[PDB]
Amino acid sequence: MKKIGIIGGGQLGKMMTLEAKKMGFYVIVLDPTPRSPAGQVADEQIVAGFFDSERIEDLVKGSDVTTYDLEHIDVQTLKKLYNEGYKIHPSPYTLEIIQDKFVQKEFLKKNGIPVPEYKLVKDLESDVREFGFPVVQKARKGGVFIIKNEKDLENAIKGETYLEEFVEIEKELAVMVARNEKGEIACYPVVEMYDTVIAPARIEEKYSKIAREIATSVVEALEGVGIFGIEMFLTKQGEILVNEIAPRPHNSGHYTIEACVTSQFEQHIRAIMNLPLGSTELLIPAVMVNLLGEEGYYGKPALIGLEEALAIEGLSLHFYGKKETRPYRKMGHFTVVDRDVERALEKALRAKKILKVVSE
Amino acid sequence: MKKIGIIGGGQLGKMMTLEAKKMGFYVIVLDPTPRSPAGQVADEQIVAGFFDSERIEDLVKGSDVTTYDLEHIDVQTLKKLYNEGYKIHPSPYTLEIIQDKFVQKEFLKKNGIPVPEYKLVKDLESDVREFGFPVVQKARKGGVFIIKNEKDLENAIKGETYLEEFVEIEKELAVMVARNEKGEIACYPVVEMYDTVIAPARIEEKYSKIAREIATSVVEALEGVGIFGIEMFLTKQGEILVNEIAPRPHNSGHYTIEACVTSQFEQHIRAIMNLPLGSTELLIPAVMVNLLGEEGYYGKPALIGLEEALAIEGLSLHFYGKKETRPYRKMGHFTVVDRDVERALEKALRAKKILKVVSE
Ligand SMILES: Nc1ncnc2c1ncn2[C@@H]1O[C@H](COP(=O)(O)OP(=O)(O)O)[C@@H](O)[C@H]1O
Ligand SMILES: Nc1ncnc2c1ncn2[C@@H]1O[C@H](COP(=O)(O)OP(=O)(O)O)[C@@H](O)[C@H]1O
Numbered sequence: 001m002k003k004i005g006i007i008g009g010g011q012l013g014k015m016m017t018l019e020a021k022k023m024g025f026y027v028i029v030l031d032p033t034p035r036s037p038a039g040q041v042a043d044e045q046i047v048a049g050f051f052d053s054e055r056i057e058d059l060v061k062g063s064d065v066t067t068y069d070l071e072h073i074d075v076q077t078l079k080k081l082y083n084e085g086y087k088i089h090p091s092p093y094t095l096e097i098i099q100d101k102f103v104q105k106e107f108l109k110k111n112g113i114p115v116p117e118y119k120l121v122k123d124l125e126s127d128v129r130e131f132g133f134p135v136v137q138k139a140r141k142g143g144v145f146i147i148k149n150e151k152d153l154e155n156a157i158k159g160e161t162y163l164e165e166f167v168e169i170e171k172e173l174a175v176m177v178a179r180n181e182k183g184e185i186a187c188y189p190v191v192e193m194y195d196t197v198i199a200p201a202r203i204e205e206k207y208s209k210i211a212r213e214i215a216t217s218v219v220e221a222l223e224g225v226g227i228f229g230i231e232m233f234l235t236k237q238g239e240i241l242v243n244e245i246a247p248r249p250h251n252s253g254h255y256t257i258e259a260c261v262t263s264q265f266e267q268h269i270r271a272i273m274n275l276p277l278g279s280t281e282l283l284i285p286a287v288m289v290n291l292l293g294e295e296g297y298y299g300k301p302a303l304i305g306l307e308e309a310l311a312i313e314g315l316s317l318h319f320y321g322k323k324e325t326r327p328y329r330k331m332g333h334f335t336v337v338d339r340d341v342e343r344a345l346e347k348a349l350r351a352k353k354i355l356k357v358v359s360e
Numbered sequence: 361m362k363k364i365g366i367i368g369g370g371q372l373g374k375m376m377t378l379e380a381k382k383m384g385f386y387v388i389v390l391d392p393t394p395r396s397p398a399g400q401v402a403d404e405q406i407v408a409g410f411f412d413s414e415r416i417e418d419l420v421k422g423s424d425v426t427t428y429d430l431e432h433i434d435v436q437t438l439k440k441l442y443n444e445g446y447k448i449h450p451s452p453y454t455l456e457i458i459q460d461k462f463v464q465k466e467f468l469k470k471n472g473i474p475v476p477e478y479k480l481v482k483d484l485e486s487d488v489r490e491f492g493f494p495v496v497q498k499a500r501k502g503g504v505f506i507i508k509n510e511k512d513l514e515n516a517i518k519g520e521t522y523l524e525e526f527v528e529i530e531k532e533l534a535v536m537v538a539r540n541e542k543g544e545i546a547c548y549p550v551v552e553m554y555d556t557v558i559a560p561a562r563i564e565e566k567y568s569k570i571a572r573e574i575a576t577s578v579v580e581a582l583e584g585v586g587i588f589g590i591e592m593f594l595t596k597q598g599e600i601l602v603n604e605i606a607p608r609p610h611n612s613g614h615y616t617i618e619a620c621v622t623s624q625f626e627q628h629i630r631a632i633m634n635l636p637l638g639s640t641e642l643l644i645p646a647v648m649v650n651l652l653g654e655e656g657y658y659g660k661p662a663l664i665g666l667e668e669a670l671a672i673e674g675l676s677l678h679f680y681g682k683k684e685t686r687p688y689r690k691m692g693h694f695t696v697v698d699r700d701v702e703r704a705l706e707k708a709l710r711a712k713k714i715l716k717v718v719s720e
Pocket of ligand 2: 532
């Protein structure tokens, strides 16, 4: 039984190990938190930090393939292990390119992938003048500040940053795309950010075809292995530009669990194990909605509105096992499937007001 | 957070456990095997046998609602607790009715539920005679013997058995049906036994309609709470008779996980928690096949044919993490979803020869 190593034992990692074991694989989770969510349901867990070079190395050498559910990781030791032959997917090199938002943009531009106009900042006040207000500023490494006036510019993000033209967004889109080392690619439906996800995106065939073609291009240019979450902007001028790349299963890909033949999590395992990719057929439209911790609440998690929300046909719930609720924190998500996406959304919005994660 | 107690740590209980925690419930599993499949992903496990009176008592009293994944359990102690007001679903009384095939037949007959003519054995030889050859003999509690003539009376089943008329079976059908304490019912599509399940059964719609009606009337008569597996016979003469009742999620219902909006396991949780039931809509036809350990293999499980099998579109694998394979033992199942049920069956049977659980 081949062993899959997973760095990061949070929710994304747990869902990963669950699908991996379901496919008959042994899983070792590396997380600093003893009995992490993923470690709890994994075969083994290495209790160490995401930069404990020594331990991440014990994971890689003790696994057939190593993957990860988060980006803030020791990419350096990973590149070394990758260079001497150990299987790490996605490649620590693509992770590196993605870590630094500027180099990610640079990479996308060079490979012919549409992206917002950007500019490395060396002379802040001098560079912003090349865009004029409003302009967008982002931190190169992990955030995003929208400079609209003088007072904001005087209080801009400090550190290594870069500028981006403020994009006139018609809609924000996303698409999961997986790829084998063999080269097979599986592209999912383009979805829409209403944080709520609408699948499929209510957009002209013309645009979804383009969004799918660009998402594939990115993974290809990257020679990626695993599943990737590509965020895009459909502009007010009819242009599709990629905003960011997530080298792992993405929150905007959860709908696949209830709406597609193979979930994003099953694809990721298939992809990193170089197995034949699974069908991405959308069996039914779906609207997903994150269950964030309520504003002004702290402590013991409490889910309210369950009975009433479950009465909505097509509604199902995914509550994560978290011991502490924090405002804005991702406590879970719920999805609504309906033959008619519009009815799916109406219901989801209705439920959104009902389902709340409170404290005590 | 409400607590759900589950007696039985096998694969069914594990699948129930996960779905339960997914809905935000706390789960405590009771199983005589330490680190049982279900206990490993539950919150707590009580190491104890299914007849350890005082231990199942701790489980029920420490839970808001208790259920089970098998029938061979201390039903009498549960009846005691149930009479004290503790929530146990399905009721120990229902479990009691189903555990004995004769009382079960007596019950169905008392409620007008279509069933084969039967008779309790007082004097084996004399009773079979007034029935005529051939006749079917069944143990009341523990399997089936067809008495073709006098000679067979010597090898007849010993103990307390009952007799029933021989039925000329055309097809064997199954249907999952869940019910709330509030009385809400949720009926699934009827499936066809090929051990491989075909969803939906390839039968004239007139039969499907009656099969779902018969099944629903069964759980209604029982005033059942939870999801039930209703096994029926479609005779050569166009009659639909109920043969068996399973008071729990059933193997013939695994298809729901891949082809229906809400799986039988989520449905079961909804029903025992008296919450609104989920949609049973069939999103796409499906064929499920059980994976059993191949003959002559013992020890650590090992799979063969995965790549060739996963190359088949719509094929997904569900390998249970059993710590040892053994001939004929259920190690998991795989499903093949396809818009065309005949292509699903074709693919499934083709893969049934490729996927195999062997020893390492
Ligand atoms: N170039 C841009 N022009 C206008 N709005 C933008 C631009 N880039 C990002 N945004 C907005 O800010 C949000 C943050 O985008 P993102 O780069 O993914 O930051 P984060 O790391 O929080 O996700 C987006 O949802 C989008 O609405
Ligand atoms: N009354 C009957 N007439 C003819 N065949 C029967 C009858 N009852 C059962 N059988 C056959 O025997 C098989 C198993 O009997 P069953 O009642 O399901 O016992 P069990 O499920 O515990 O093995 C059925 O699948 C069916 O093919």
